[PDB]
């Protein structure tokens, strides 16, 4: 009845089952699980070598979390550690349907507020600063608070730099396609789409997931990508289709197209870190111009070029994005070990 | 220091609605338990009615991403109506409010008796639910406390054709609620396996589009063709065979169609290829399963029809504390 369903909220699962709680937000419509409690504890010193051990040993608690049931194929996670670097807050490993990312800007933007309003650093007015080890590098995070609020959260990626521009792949079943390569804290493969006919709208949404998966695999297996330092790092995220902006002070849209078929609801943090270093590139914007890129679902970010720089050979910027992010729910997981899915599925 | 993401809480001016999460045969169900508004009415149609003309964004603030998603599925559970329920149910979906819903029956039998709702008693509860279609009854097996199987009867479910279309694929086209095309998946070269998930939707859609184009499907009272089932070979020794249901614009089903397995029970004793009695185990595209059995003959209009019984069972996956911020543009979700 209505009385009785006092009966489900006292309900307890039995000591055996394993209780993983989370803090999940979206930023700009694209979600994240923050891990809080109940799971395994994760060795290393380094946020590398921390991303290496849950890749070997503790997969299948990704594949829990963030596939179907609890779950689905478009969930993004975030394991929040002790800092590894001096001058950090703390540190983080970001996973996904596929796997572990480098880097990932939506979430950054999450973490960076629910810092501020949940008491992971302490508040301070105007901006409070906080500084988070990530796969990629050190990430600056700068919280925009007003009489105890967050109002919008803007950081400083790594580096962001081109590693190949106007290059051709032919991609077996759809032909030939122009592309650009640059890193924003993951490597991405921008690809035009109106030039191969489909639009950064929903209306498209399986075909970019279709032909978007095909772009990347095909560069994967015929392009080496390479980071300068580090070889965890050295690998294609995604697919990023450019399209033509929908609202008025907005400069473009991204649908990026990322882990085994997963699509980004925001804009690409990292998409936008390395879009402006293309923009900055080939001169299309200036340095201190901030620009409004959009999303598949009409959210937006901002970016802009805060300073040139020189990152191992290549020509680089650091770019600053900034968005919002809200808070939508606190979730205990129960998995059943005699459940026949109590690790997920994914369907592809 | 997460123990102070732990420690926190929403302000108190925010909406916070609770739930039970559950899957049956990999199909989620999110049970409200709490938070929720009033949902006024004497009727489960007219609580219904209450609910989709005011209450509409909460459905999508809990079935819609970022909270939900394009396959999750809820539940309300109400004050029962009628002098024998035990309580009521409103079904909630991501494109609106189904009237019954096969997958949903099996995991609220299963909360039911596990936490709560009815009276455990062994070796069968019944539960007697107002819903949207009228009062169903659902059977719990239970034994040591702990819920087995839960079963159910599905309306008459009859076979309409046994046909060819054009390669050239064989069918046969059943109701079981819904009416659906079933093809043998080995004679067109697919699986009904994770490896052919996208071939499965790509020729399951041609094949429903070619049967539709062709032939006329005709509801004996109010239809159309809801999907196409593939048909494969069990991976267990035990199980009579496999389902995968392409429905609607290449969505597929997880589970063994409840109202598949009664349209295929129907076509399966029309070949008198299983006897009334006898229960039959099948598959899905994951793995999970559904048993089927024809209870009775029946008749339905002008066709010969039988009573299917539809049994499985549900995992509980989840508590959760959905918060609504009312800052946010996306508070009442998005469809993607």
Redesign the interface.
Request: glycine share 4%.
């Given at each position: 009845?209505?009385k009785?369903?006092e009966?489900?909220?006292?309900?307890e699962?039995p000591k055996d089952w394993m209780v993983i709680?989370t803090?999940?937000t979206?930023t700009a419509?694209?979600?994240l699980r923050?891990i809080?409690?109940g799971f395994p504890e994760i060795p290393g010193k380094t946020i590398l070598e921390k991303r290496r051990y849950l890749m070997e040993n503790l997969d299948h608690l990704r594949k829990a979390l963030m596939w179907?049931?609890?779950?689905?194929?478009?969930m993004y996670g975030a394991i929040?550690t002790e800092p590894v670097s001096e001058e950090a807050d703390?540190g983080v490993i970001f996973m996904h349907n596929e796997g572990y990312s480098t880097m990932c800007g939506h979430a950054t933007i999450a973490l960076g507020k629910?810092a501020v309003?949940?008491?992971?650093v302490e508040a301070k007015e105007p901006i409070t600063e906080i500084k988070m080890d990530s796969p990629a590098g050190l990430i600056k995070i700068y919280v925009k608070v007003r009489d105890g609020k967050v109002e919008k959260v803007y950081f400083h990626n790594v580096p962001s730099f081109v590693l190949f521009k106007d290059e051709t792949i032919n991609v077996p079943g759809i032909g030939e396609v122009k592309y650009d390569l640059a890193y924003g804290g993951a490597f991405y493969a921008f690809v035009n789409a109106e030039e191969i006919g489909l639009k950064c709208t929903?209306e498209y949404?399986?075909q970019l997931i279709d032909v978007g998966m095909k772009i990347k695999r095909a560069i994967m297996s015929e392009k080496e990508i390479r980071h300068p330092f580090e070889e965890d790092l050295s690998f294609l995220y995604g697919t990023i289709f450019i399209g033509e902006p929908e609202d008025e002070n907005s400069h473009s849209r991204h649908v990026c197209i990322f882990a085994d078929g997963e699509?980004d609801?925001s804009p690409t943090g990292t998409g936008v870190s390395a879009r402006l270093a293309i923009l900055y590139e080939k001169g299309e914007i200036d340095i201190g111009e901030e620009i409004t890129i959009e999303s598949?679902?009409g959210?937006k970010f901002t970016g802009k070029v805060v300073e040139e720089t020189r990152y191992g050979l290549y020509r680089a910027i650091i770019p600053e994005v900034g968005g919002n992010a809200?808070?939508?729910?606190?979730?205990?997981?129960?998995?059943?070990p005699q459940?026949?899915?109590?690790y997920g599925?994914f369907?592809?």
């Open positions: 009845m209505f009785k369903l009966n489900l909220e006292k309900w699962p709680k803090l999940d979206h419509g694209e979600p923050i809080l409690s179907e049931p609890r779950g689905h194929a478009d929040i703390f629910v309003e949940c008491g992971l929903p949404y399986r699509v609801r598949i679902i959210t809200y808070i939508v729910a606190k979730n205990t997981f129960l998995i059943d459940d026949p899915l109590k599925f369907l592809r």
